[PDB]
């Protein structure tokens, strides 16, 4: 489907991902029939020429999609601002006949991309003029098209919600903030953090909101005069009222109201100062640059690089440079030019001291977070006192992330003024009783933990409905704000067809989607699916290590997740599993011989490995034994084979950075949608919930949080199958069976 | 076999790992029969008494293993060096009525601990005389036993080889490493990283061993002086000679002649003077104080906390008080005076600039690891140029570490100008040709990949001994150094008693033993076991988290091993396991009807989990399957059962800092003395190797490392089930049965 | 199987290596196939004796037989053929498992 070359290159601040959008990149090239040139050093190898620009085959990019960095350096030129590197540049690139260019890297990169794109024409002129070339050459390549990639850890581009290699910085962020909350819970001190990015406090604030720290500085919302007092009086108040520990987040480019820098120093000196309290500061420096990258930063990446490729043999001279970005969960194209000046213009915005313009300016979803922040940093002092009656319960198998969403809940709950009672092990519990009053400081921490501390369970509520009928009214409890899997919504499902016949389930419940299969019908992503994905995209790399150890091999692995397939495709995508078995997907025998032919064709190359997953209930016969049986004999003399089954290890250990933060943002949105709904429904000194409209499950759909009915959701839900009808994921498949050969 | 009462606390700088310490303290003393206390805040809230101190049951130290820091506070007190201070702890204890106290910290906790000690008759005195306590009382405690256990990742105590979380704190280093090293090599960027150590440099040493860092400060060796000059040559020798990144590391007690601290800052301006490189520096800070101890941590904890309960339940008030340290791979006790005036002694030695002294006064062990990291660090030019030929194998599954030994191999093998070639695909390469020499550049890199570059299979000699001895001919090897687990030995046994039958294999051939399992005779670490041991801690800790999510729930994860249950049995111990199941153990079902009812007897109590490891092969009819099956019919009505195995996981990722270190030192030490024999039996103009002498296994025996011939060892190898008749690790078992209800 | 329309059995003889004993009592009662060691077979001949069982359904005589020496080919379990029949003979039949254990050591002598 194409007859033309295509270069590539990374440039700028390394951010970790770049690797597997360069992978994407290239072996879509191939996988089209382009040829594809990988530039070294980024622009100064390619002003030099030569043996900085060489050929790649289909294995050139392989043993790289789990590691951090780039391979092809991305150094920092200085002859490409000046005319003759970049003519030079052109001579080059015609040499090599490359008329499509691919780059990755910061806001200044693609603006001199495209600078170099708009007087191409130009540069063949005088080229042609000085007798390097001839006419005939630059008639053929007299066109150059620009596809852009945003690779850098700030997050500061405000035209894509998310930049390559952020949520890999969120966890290297994480786990140092991990490590260091363990000693300053130990030794009761008080300590300052240093995040990098440049001018942008999104790292410093999701960090601040995923660890629950006491106080945050970033430069969007600079603090307000005297904020020396307020923060000896919040501090106080925290380490006073059992806060053991107080953690103090600060990005580097951290202002006050003049715009003057604020340095860590001074606040150590400060709060010494004012307070006393022993107290350290840690500048974590390039670690954000570094690490392995996360599944989903991976994912992405590929996408990313799947979508430059696309766009690079699609666009025309007359279509302006463009670049790849994030609209809500799809892969959007946006116009570079647009996008500079609106950075540019949020830059003047910011420094010309009109921080609120800036602000609207780069979007209205961190201030909401910042406001989310602030809600949940400390303990306001409630008024309302209202008579509304809360229960919280976790229903499901145990996931990443229910503990963060309790505990927002909760606090919001208090800080409403509503009384909060927390249940014990779900459904069965509340037909024991189990039921508790939960205080403020009685869920501290819980934002750090994985799992369920409460407990969950498989019971379902029909079995008892008459002990929940008469523990609901002992303790009027006059909401339902459940976080759990599918057996959490069929749940909320049977009791509300059950309100016709008791007259006492007329009560508002939500359902806060939280499971590994990502199977809940309502939402787009699973809270707790992440950190799953993390994990088998690990342990399959470490299978992925032991099977190159001793080449030609081939593994089996099992992953969870019931008849979903999410779970193993976007695994498989991670670690470049050669094939990925799934329900949705059926398949017979002949299927199999030709991924046996596959990998018996791949065993004759330098890379002697493979890898297939097999997601856990894909065909009611094909067992794993049955995969492993087949490959060992049709295979005898090329490879042998072995199998695997990821246990529970794919539940997690401690929760990963979006899980934290989606688990708190959902917690307060469906704690604020709640409260909304109980203040409606209240009528004669009683709550009455008879539509189906109070029976709705909060979710994050394309764009934004929606709430659908419990009820209108069931026209859209294989209940045999416990999965809805059609998934909006279905297209990753394509890409991964594209990046295989 | 106790009547009395225990006390624990921890003081000092906090070290990851007074959890695991706490933990078995505690669970000793209550299995002796003694009463124990929790003293909390350490020798603040001894002072202070009252609700500091606080008694503790079975289930008080339970979750805490797998948590860095400490639960009980260690705050610093002040009031505790004055005698009013002394006399109120005093008084807090007999109120309590406990005798023995077990403390953890650094020196200076143990120098108070031993004044409380010195002066326990003189505070009961001023306690009965100002009518606080009565005469019975006071004869009562007459006497107080001290126990110290010495927690600090400086690893400054002299007697000691590994104090309690010096492991964890090298993770911590080697994790920041490993992310700086990829943006290191994207940017082509040296960093300069400071680490941690009070005023000892064993942790910059370690750490630069085990990254094939550029350049070392230390305080225990200083600078000779125009230093600066020799860090001009070699950094412009490494980036030249296709080094791409530069790594200084520096210890925060570094020093000159004079003594005089080295700045990081300096440091960094002196590279960027001297030569322009970019340059960056990177503070750890305190990140090595925190996060979740390593396996050997924990272990190492468990340990020394059973002999300090030992210690203070068989001490008697003659006895002087004791510590628990480190010889070869026991638990010995040493003097706590003795030990605190030689690191005195020592510090005073390094500040009076007598740096030799110093060096001696730490131990020979130290200053070998210098010279190792100076040969191994630039290519000294060769001049014998000898006329041996070497050739290296990978043999046995692959194993984290066999990378590491063959660049520290080769390297060595270059400097002393011997030709040295690396077989491919052990054995069945060797008889398949693919024999290639190596040099200096040809091997960068390796020592921080896991895996087995090389690439190893289990095949045998014997099936194609005419094509091995061919190409030995040809190639004219003169002496082979296979790397490999049991089948490495094997093999290598086969060739020796093949001597007879041949001339050509009158070869000196020496076997590194690398393997998981642990299961090489004449060693008491194989290489690689530690990466296998700490993938399994992770695996079984998430296992637990999960299995705490679903409340009432056991595990059966089956672990590999081959038959030595090594693996199996320290996993065990470093998760807390109820039992681990292991063929050097026998058990019918009897052990299993008792283990079922200790399970049901655990889940009537709040910690209503499980988990149980079963060694691959522990028993040849009792799958894992059978006690599934066991165990969910013995508590049906109670609780649930699963199983997972952990297939090719435990192999592991990245190598542990001791893999890399104990890679390296066999690397160099199996070379010495190769080239050394190799030189003894060179006569005549022709290489004749016949005595048994001329086959060894280097291993790191009890104390240090010694060559045992290969088929000496042959008396003490169980070649039915591949491991030897006795091994060292059977006494572990005692600590893992005891340390669970 | 000939009661129960639309049946196949897989049915795993006594032998050892040897596959005389499958072979012969495969004459004997006329069974579709009889695995054996000593002809080796791959998965185009199970595909193959799949889509014969296929087409044979069709006829009014809808049973089947295929028989299977214990030891005939290292990793093609019985369990392996009773799932490759089922699922891709899914829609025309069903199919079950047998093992003549030691019956194949009889009872009286014969004659
Ligand atoms: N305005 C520009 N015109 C031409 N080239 C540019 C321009 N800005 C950046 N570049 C090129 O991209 C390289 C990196 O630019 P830099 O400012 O360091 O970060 P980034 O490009 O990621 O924003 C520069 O060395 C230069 O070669
Ligand atoms: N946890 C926090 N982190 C950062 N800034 C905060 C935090 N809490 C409050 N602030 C800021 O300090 C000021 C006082 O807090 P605020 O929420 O306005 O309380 P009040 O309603 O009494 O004025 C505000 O400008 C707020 O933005
Ligand atoms: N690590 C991730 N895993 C899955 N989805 C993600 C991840 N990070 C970002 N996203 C998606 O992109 C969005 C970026 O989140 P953000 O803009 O910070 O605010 P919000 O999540 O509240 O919309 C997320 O909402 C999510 O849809
Ligand atoms: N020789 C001593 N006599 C009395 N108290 C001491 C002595 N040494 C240390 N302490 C006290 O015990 C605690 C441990 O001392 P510190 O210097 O903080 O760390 P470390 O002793 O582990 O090196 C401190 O609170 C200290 O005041
Ligand atoms: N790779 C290195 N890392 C750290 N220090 C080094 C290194 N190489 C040399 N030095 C320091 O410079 C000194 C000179 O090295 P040395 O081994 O004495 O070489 P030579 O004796 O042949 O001149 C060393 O003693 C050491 O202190
Ligand atoms: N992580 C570990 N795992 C197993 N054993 C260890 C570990 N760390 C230390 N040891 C034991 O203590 C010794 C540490 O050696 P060290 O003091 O660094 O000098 P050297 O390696 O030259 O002997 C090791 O040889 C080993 O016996
Ligand atoms: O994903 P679901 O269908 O909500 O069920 C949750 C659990 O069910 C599983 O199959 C395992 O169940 P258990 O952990 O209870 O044994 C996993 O897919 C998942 O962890
Ligand atoms: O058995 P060895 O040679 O002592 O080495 C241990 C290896 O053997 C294993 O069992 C591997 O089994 P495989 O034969 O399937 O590779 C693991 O315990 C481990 O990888
Ligand atoms: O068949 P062989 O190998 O000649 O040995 C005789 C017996 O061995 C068998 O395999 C039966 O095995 P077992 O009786 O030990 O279970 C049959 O072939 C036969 O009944
Ligand atoms: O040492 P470096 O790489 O120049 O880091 C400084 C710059 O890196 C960045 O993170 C680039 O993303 C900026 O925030 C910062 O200005
Ligand atoms: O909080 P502290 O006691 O000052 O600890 C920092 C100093 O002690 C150490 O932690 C020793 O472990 C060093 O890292 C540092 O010199």
Same mark, same amino acid.
């Given at each position: 489907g194409a007859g033309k070359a295509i270069g590539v290159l990374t440039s700028g601040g390394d951010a970790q991902g770049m690797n597997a959008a360069v992978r994407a990149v290239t072996r879509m090239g191939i996988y089209v029939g382009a040829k594809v040139f990988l530039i070294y050093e980024g622009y100064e190898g390619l002003v030099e020429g030569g043996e900085n620009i060489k050929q790649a085959n289909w294995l050139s990019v392989s043993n790289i999609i789990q590691l951090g960095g780039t391979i092809i350096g991305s150094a920092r030129c200085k002859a490409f601002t000046t005319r003759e590197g970049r003519r030079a540049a052109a001579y080059n690139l015609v040499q090599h006949g490359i008329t499509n260019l691919c780059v990755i890297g910061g806001d200044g990169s693609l603006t001199g991309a495209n600078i170099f794109r708009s007087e191409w024409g130009s540069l063949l002129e005088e080229l042609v003029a000085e007798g390097k070339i001839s006419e005939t050459t630059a008639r053929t390549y007299s066109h150059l098209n620009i596809a852009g990639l945003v690779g850098s850890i700030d997050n500061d581009f405000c035209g894509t919600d998310m930049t390559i290699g952020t949520d890999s910085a969120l966890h290297r962020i994480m786990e140092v903030i991990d490590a260091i909350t363990t000693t300053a819970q130990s030794h009761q001190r008080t300590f300052v953090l240093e995040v990098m990015g440049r001018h942008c406090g999104y790292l410093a604030?999701?960090? %601040?909101?995923?660890? !629950? %720290?006491?106080?945050?500085? $970033? =430069? +969007?919302?600079? =603090? +307000?005069? !005297?904020?020396?007092?307020? @923060? *000896?009086?919040?501090?106080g108040e925290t380490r006073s009222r059992g806060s053991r520990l107080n953690i103090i987040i600060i990005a580097e480019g951290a202002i006050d109201r003049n715009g003057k820098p604020i340095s860590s120093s001074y606040v150590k000196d400060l709060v010494v100062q004012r307070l006393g309290f022993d107290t350290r500061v840690t500048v974590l420096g390039? &670690?954000?640059?570094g690490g392995t990258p996360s599944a989903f930063d991976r994912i992405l990446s590929s996408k990313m690089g799947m979508e430059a490729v696309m766009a690079l043999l699609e666009? /025309? =001279?007359? /279509?302006?440079?463009? &670049? &790849? /970005?994030?609209s809500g969960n799809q892969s959007v194209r946006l116009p570079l030019m647009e996008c500079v000046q609106m950075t540019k213009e949020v830059q003047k915005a910011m420094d010309d001291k009109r921080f609120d313009e800036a602000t609207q300016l780069r979007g209205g979803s961190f201030e909401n977070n910042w406001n989310i922040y602030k809600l949940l940093a400390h303990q306001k002092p409630p008024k309302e006192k209202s008579n509304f009656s809360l229960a919280i319960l976790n229903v499901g198998a145990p996931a990443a992330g229910m503990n963060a969403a309790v505990r927002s809940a909760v606090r919001t709950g208090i800080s409403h003024g509503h009384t909060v009672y927390v249940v014990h092990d779900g459904f069965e519990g509340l037909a024991k009783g189990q039921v508790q009053e939960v205080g403020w400081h009685d869920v501290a921490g819980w934002l750090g933990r994985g799992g369920s501390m409460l407990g969950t369970k498989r019971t379902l509520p029909k079995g008892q409905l008459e002990s929940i009928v008469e523990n609901i009214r002992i303790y009027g409890i006059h909401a339902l704000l459940v976080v759990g899997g599918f057996e959490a919504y069929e749940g909320v499902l049977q009791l509300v067809e059950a309100? !016709?016949?008791? +007259?006492?389930?007329? $009560?508002? @419940? *939500?359902?806060? =989607? %939280? /499971?590994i299969s990502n199977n809940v019908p309502g939402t787009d992503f699973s809270l707790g699916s992440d950190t799953a994905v993390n994990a088998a995209m690990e342990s399959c790399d470490r299978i992925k290590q032991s099977a190159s150890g001793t080449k030609r091999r081939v593994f089996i692995v099992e992953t969870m997740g019931g008849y979903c397939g999410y779970l193993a495709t976007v695994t498989g995508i991670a670690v470049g599993a050669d094939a990925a078995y799934v329900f949705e997907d059926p398949f017979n025998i002949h299927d199999l011989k030709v991924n046996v032919e596959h990998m018996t064709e791949k065993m004759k190359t330098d890379i002697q490995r493979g890898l297939v997953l097999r997601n856990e209930k894909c065909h009611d016969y094909y067992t794993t034994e049955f995969l492993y049986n087949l490959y060992s004999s049709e295979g005898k003399g090329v490879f042998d084979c072995r199998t695997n089954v990821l246990g529970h290890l794919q539940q997690g250990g401690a929760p990963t950075p979006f899980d934290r933060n989606y688990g708190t943002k959902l917690g307060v949105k469906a704690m604020l949608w709640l409260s909304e709904k109980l203040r409606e429904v209240y009528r004669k000194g009683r709550v009455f919930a008879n539509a189906p409209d109070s029976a709705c499950v909060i979710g994050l759909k394309k764009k934004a949080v929606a709430f659908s009915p419990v009820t209108e959701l069931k026209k859209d839900t294989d209940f045999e199958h416990r999965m809805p009808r059609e998934q909006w994921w279905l297209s990753l498949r394509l890409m991964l069976k594209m990046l295989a050969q």
């Open positions: 604030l999701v960090s %601040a909101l995923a660890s !629950g %720290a006491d106080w945050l500085f $970033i =430069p +969007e919302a600079p =603090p +307000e005069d !005297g904020w020396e007092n307020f @923060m *000896c009086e919040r501090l390039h &670690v954000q640059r666009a /025309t =001279p007359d /279509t302006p440079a463009c &670049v &790849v /970005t994030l309100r !016709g016949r008791y +007259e006492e389930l007329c $009560i508002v @419940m *939500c359902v806060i =989607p %939280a /499971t």
